[model samples]
Target chain A: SRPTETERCIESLIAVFQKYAGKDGHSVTLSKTEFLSFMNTELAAFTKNQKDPGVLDRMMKKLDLNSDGQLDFQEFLNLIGGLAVACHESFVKAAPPQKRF
Target chain B: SRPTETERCIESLIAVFQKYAGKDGHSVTLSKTEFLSFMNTELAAFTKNQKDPGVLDRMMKKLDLNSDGQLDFQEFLNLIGGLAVACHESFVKAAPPQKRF
Candidate 1:
């Protein structure tokens, strides 16, 4: 049986993380350089359009929970989760208005 | 010109969510019935192996924030993010032992 769409999505998430993590194999987590590379390359559409150079620096600082200047899988997921919800918010805005809660 | 792996992953996440959300178009969220179908079909590998019948019930209760029986996109992303980190933990365990810190 073919993998379900959700299964594929999960696989893609893990695969992309693995693709960017530990490329040099010193640490399992993403170093500052690795993270910058991940964002700049994998998310160039967003990164390239940014007018402020400090944005990426601020992003890495905020996402690096342990203050180690590195991002573990959990932290990486946070970035993805945050982006997902932000996108969903736009979707909600575009959809027809519903009952107020 | 092709999308990066990260871009593809994000697209897949959104596409999968949109696939399952509001199949009948009454609500943009996943009702309990839709969530069950999503779990049973999209994540059958885990759902089918569960010996406890209450597992899914408990899962919905925990993942559904706002106490709404339906799961908004944010709540659904929580489930996906949680599962990703759990899977990553197993990955970490299987990897070579590193410095503990």
Candidate 2:
């Protein structure tokens, strides 16, 4: 059976992570370099828009909750979650008020 | 600038959630009916394969971490995170082993 939309989305997340995570060291986690590569390539729009380049550096530090100097799948998801939340908030704010019955 | 692959994925996540969540009640969260609609439509492949349909009912309960009967963005992301982790595991197992130096 063809993959569901959710399944495809999940697969894309994993594939994008691996594509960068496999660049160095253990393939299961992303080194700092790998994480930066992901942010710069897969998330360039957001990254480039930042006023301070150090923002990404700080974000990497914040997302690396374990302080292991690497980001595992969970940590990677955290970054995505944060960005998604920000996007959602913006979307909601931009939308016009709903009509009340 | 064009949306990055990661941006598109994130947008898809938000769009899918909004599409279902807007079906009833508050548009920001997914009530039981909205959750079921999302699962049945966006995740039919997984839902149809379940041995017991009650699994989805249970899943909704589990995913609704705050005991609120509805799934907020954070809770919804948890579901996506769980599935992404599971899919990543399967992908790792299926991939060929790396060569030793």
Q: Which ten residues in a row have the lowest lDDT in candidate 1 chain A?
A: A85-94
Regions of candidate 2 where Cα sits further than 4 Å from its true position: A1-4, A23-26, A52-61, A67-69, A88-101, B23-26, B51-64, B67-69, B88-101
Q: Per-residue alpha-carbon lDDT of model 1 for A1-101, expressed as tens digits?
A: 13666776776766556567754444546555666677666766545666444435455566746735555664665565455544333154445454232
Q: Which prediction has the highest DockQ against the true structure? A: 1
For model 1 chain B, where is the 10-residue window of minimal lDDT? B85-94
Q: iRMS values in order, in angstroms?
A: 3.5, 3.5
TM-score of chain A of each: 0.61, 0.64
Model 2 chain A scores worst on lDDT over the 10 consecutive residues at A86-95
True contacts kept of each: 0.41, 0.38
lDDT of 2 by residue, A27-84 (tens): 5666666676677677765577674454365556677455355567756665655556
At residue A2, what lDDT does model 2 achieve? 51
Best model per TM-score: 2
